[PDB]
Structure formats: C-alpha cells, structure tokens
Amino acid sequence: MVSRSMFDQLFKHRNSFYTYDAFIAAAKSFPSFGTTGDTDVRKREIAAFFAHVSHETSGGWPTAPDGPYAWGLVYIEEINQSNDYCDPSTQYPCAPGKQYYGRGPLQLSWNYNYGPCGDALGLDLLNNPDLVAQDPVIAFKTALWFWMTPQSPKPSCHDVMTGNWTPSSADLAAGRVPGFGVTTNIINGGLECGKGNPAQAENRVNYYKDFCNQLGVSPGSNLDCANMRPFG
C-alpha cells in the first residue's frame, strides 16, 4: 500500500485526526486502490489521490516548513457552515436539522452525494452527515468512494489512472486523454478545466508532481486540463 513512514513524510504537518491506521482501514474497503497495475501505475494513482486530497485540505503557506505541498490533510470541515447544501430530493431527502457542507479529504458535499456515498458504505450519512467529521475512517472512506465510483458519463478517477478507461472518439476530440488532467476534470472540471481560470488545476498538478518525485515515479502524460472540455 503506502508505508506508515511514507504517509508521515507526505503528510508531515497534517491534522492528527487523519491517522495512518484510519487511512489503511478505509483503503481495505476499496482493495483495488493503489494495487492496480504495475509499480509505476500504482505509485501514480496513490500520488494522484493524495495530491487532490492535499489541495482540498491544505493548511500551507508559501514559506511553510517543508514547502507549500507538505501541509495536506489539515482541514476537516468547510469553514462557512451557514448554507445547508440541500437540494430537495425524494430519493435523498435532506434530514431536518442537518447540513451537507464539505467534510473530509475530498470535501464531500450535498445531500445528493452524502446519500449515495452512505448507501455504498453501509452508513446513514444522509441522516448523520456529521459522521464524516467525527470518524477518520469514515472521512477517508468518503474520499475513496468518490475516487473509485463512476458517475456516467464520467469514469472513476481510479479507472482513468490505471488504464481501465479508454476514451471515446468524442472524449479524444475534446482533449480528454487519460492522465492526471482528466482526474481534475472529473473532480471539478466545470470550474477548473477548459476555459476556467487555471490556477487551482495548476496547484493540484504541483502537488502531484511533488508526490511523484517523493515516491520515485514519473508523473506521466496529460497533466494539464486547460486543453480539455469538461464531460457533458
């Protein structure tokens, strides 16, 4: 998987909520994560997941010890907790008294994501969304759920990084060629790819390249997403 000492090197300044043991327990619920493909493909997948996590939870600053990519996994909850992040749903009804703001390593948000994520994990996250911010095993599981789960027309980020997604002719025409860039496109491409301001996407790439360097792997091809359109 990832050794404890390597986890503690990549995430040297993290919030101690996010324990290595909790990450390992979560990954055992998604056993193909980081175990798919040859050695370089596995390292790239792990670096890619951790890069996105770090970008979404970073407490870094430009003169921080160990540099601006060493401060991933500092944040648990979204700061502004005034909006409920509730879109009325008959399938995933918003629980009275609860809110669906961002929680965990990939900032799970909205009743319409807490619902299906919870169902897949066997946890009532729709009616107890605060679970994600209480229990680091659950927190990591919500992030791996997102990484590992297709949402047609989008493949899973896992499949993109491990050779299990082959683009259609339309994907290719749109610049969606397998690599790290497509994972940014899946996560938040409507805001960060295409003609969006490229700053956030370029930050994700910088974490990814740094983590690939530490793991001793080439980052591979197609890292940018400015030359690709978000999935329809």
Numbering used by the authors: 0 to 231
List sentences from the manuscript.
GH19 chitinase hydrolyzes the glycosidic bonds of chitin, namely beta-1, 4-linked N-acetyl-D-glucosamine. One of the physiological roles of chitinase is to defend plants against pathogenic fungi by degrading chitin, a major component of the cell wall of many fungi. We demonstrate that this remote loop directly accesses the fungal cell wall, and surprisingly, it needs to adopt a defined structure supported by long-range intramolecular interactions to perform its function.
To investigate the contribution to the antifungal activity of the 45 substitutions, we constructed mutants of Anc4 + Loop II with substitutions in proximity to loop II. We chose six substitutions within 4.0 Å from Loop II and introduced them accordingly to their proximity to each other’s. Two substitutions, p12K and n13H (small and large character indicates Anc4 and Anc5 state, respectively), formed new hydrogen bonding with Asp73 residue in loop II. The His 13 residue is also involved in hydrophobic interaction with Trp78 residue in loop II (upper left in the enlargement). d197(217)R (residue numbers are responsible to Anc5ΔLoop I; residue numbers in Anc5 state are in parentheses) substitution formed new hydrogen bonds between the N terminus and the tenth α-helix (upper right in the enlargement). n193(213)G substitution reduced structural hindrance with the Tyr76 residue in loop II (bottom left in the enlargement). Mutations A, B, and C increased antifungal activity 4.7, 1.2, and 5.4-fold, respectively. These substitutions increased antifungal activity while retaining the same degree of chitinase activity. MD simulations of these mutants revealed a gradual reduction of loop II flexibility directly related to the introduction of these six substitutions Furthermore, these substitutions decreased only the mobility of loop II not the one of a loop region between the ninth and tenth α-helices (positions 192–201). Furthermore, crystal structures of Anc4 + Loop II + A and Anc4 + Loop II + A + B + C revealed that their loop II structures are retained as in the structure of Anc5’s loop II, namely the antifungal active variant. Altogether, these results exemplify that antifungal activity enhanced by cell wall binding activity is supported by the substitutions that rigidify loop II.
